[model samples]
Target: YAFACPACPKRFMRSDALSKHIKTAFIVVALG
Candidate 1:
């Protein structure tokens, strides 16, 4: 009844849980 979110290897039971992570998953590293 649940799945792991590959983004952070975090487990989520509902879509919104994963969905919430979707927006704040990727990080943009600025190189100088």
Candidate 2:
């Protein structure tokens, strides 16, 4: 299933995918 982000209107293929996207894109304080 796919999920859509209410904050950014971003679409993800799965729940884990959305979680990763939020952790990567939304979390600006963290670095790689």
Candidate 3:
């Protein structure tokens, strides 16, 4: 019951949670 992000070595219990994490990461990346 976990999903992995292809962009990093992190695990998420829900797929929806993973997507939000990815979105937040993208925002950080964009800021740089």
Candidate 4:
């Protein structure tokens, strides 16, 4: 099982892991 970030396009396994990557990443999209 693998997934990718919608912005960064990085491959990873487990949805939880994907979210983890996003949080640790530069997070190109952030706003309120």
Q: Kindly report which residue stretches of model 1 are placed more than 4 angstroms away from their true locations once superposed.
A: 1-13, 26-32
Write model 1 residue lDDT over 1-32, tens digit each, in one string: 24443543334336545555565655543110
The C-alpha stretches of model 4 lying farther than 4 A from their native spots are 1-13, 23-32
How many clashes (backbone N, Cα, C below 3 Å) per candidate? 0, 0, 0, 0
User: What value of lDDT does candidate 3 attain over all alpha carbons?
Assistant: 0.51
TM-score of each: 0.22, 0.22, 0.22, 0.21
Model 3 agreement with the true structure over 1-32: per-residue lDDT tens digits: 34553644345335555566565766654333
For model 4, state the Cα shift of residue 24 in Å.
Answer: 5.8
Query: For candidate 4, what is the TM-score?
Result: 0.21
Kindly list the per-residue Cα lDDT of model 4 for residues 1-32, writing each as its tens digit: 24443643445245555465565655453210
> Evaluated with lDDT, which candidate comes out highest?
3
lDDT of 4: 0.46
